[PDB]
């Protein structure tokens, strides 16, 4: 069960080719888009289908230079921790034993442990937030979540904010564990995200199923 195996038929779809072609055309026309084309599918690269244990949905990649690199919420090394990720940290410190706030926002180690850090829209025009929505990525990421709901069993979904929560409609809630809560954005963290305990609840669900829990402390690769 790999991505190339289940997504092969979807790569052929007219709407999908339309999207990649629009993005590519814009890049060719001098429109800077993030992340670099080489990093657009990193989430699937780092986390294969049989390895998906936790699914955390984001919206679109960061629109600033050097921030995004294919993973949701994660920023490259040397980039300031974005406010939301910071609040994700504040909740982890409060709940996960042994967790101390990191000094970066690079989450490759999460992806390596089975956390599919997926943004619903995989690209953005530099400087303009949400510039690539209603362009095809949503349909694609809808199928991706549909494929996970289908071929897998017991995956714990972490849906933050009402936008993300809408994608729970295609997830059988008896087949998969779905945890809802408001977005970790400073504006909304104080109405349900803080104290949601999503991280510890996620690991408890993973241990009560034979799977090895996630070590939420992110690590930095050398040099």
């Amino acid at each position: 069960l790999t991505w190339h195996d289940v997504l092969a038929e979807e790569k052929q779809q007219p709407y999908f080719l339309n999207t990649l072609q629009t993005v590519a055309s814009e890049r060719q026309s001098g429109v800077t888009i993030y992340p670099p084309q080489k990093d657009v599918f990193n989430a699937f690269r780092f986390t294969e289908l049989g390895d998906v244990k936790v699914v955390i949905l984001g919206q679109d990649p960061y629109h600033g230079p050097g921030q995004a690199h294919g993973l949701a919420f994660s920023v490259r090394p040397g980039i300031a921790i974005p406010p939301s990720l910071l609040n994700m940290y504040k909740e982890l410190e409060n709940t996960i034993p042994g967790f101390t706030r990191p000094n970066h926002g690079y989450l490759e180690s999460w992806a390596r442990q089975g956390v599919l850090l997926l943004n619903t829209v995989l690209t953005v025009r530099a400087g303009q937030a949400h510039s690539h929505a209603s362009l095809g990525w949503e349909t694609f990421t809808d199928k991706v979540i549909s494929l996970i709901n289908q071929h897998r069993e017991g995956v714990v979904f972490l849906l933050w904010g009402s936008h993300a929560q809408k994608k729970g409609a295609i997830i059988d809630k008896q087949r998969h564990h779905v945890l809802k809560a408001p977005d970790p954005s400073p504006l909304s963290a104080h109405r349900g995200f803080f104290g949601c305990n999503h991280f510890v609840l996620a690991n408890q669900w993973l241990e009560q199923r034979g799977e090895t829990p996630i070590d939420w402390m992110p690590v930095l690769p050398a040099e």
Binding site: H63, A80, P83, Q128, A129, S131, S162, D183, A189
Partner: protein, 82 residues
């Protein structure tokens, strides 16, 4: 641009780190006023005061300024309609 609108109301020069999309119902509670459409919460951090300056606008490509929210080290907002 959006960064100037932040400097226009607060006098502080900050870079927008993230822009989180939010539905009318979500921002209705916190702000205490339901917006006409989807809102983008443009968030910038100001370590100088440990505050979070959030510039809320309508969705792309209009980005019509809706309000300015400042949150302090106590998670308390200071809302200002634009």
């Amino acid at each position: 641009n959006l960064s100037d609108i932040i400097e226009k109301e607060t006098g502080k020069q900050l870079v927008i780190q993230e822009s989180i999309l939010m539905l009318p119902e979500e921002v209705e509670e916190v702000i205490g006023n339901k917006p006409e459409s989807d809102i983008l919460v443009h968030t910038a951090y100001d370590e100088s005061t440990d505050e979070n300056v959030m510039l809320l606008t309508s969705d792309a490509p209009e980005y019509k300024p809706w309000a300015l929210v400042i949150q302090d080290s106590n998670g308390e907002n200071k809302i200002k309609m634009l």
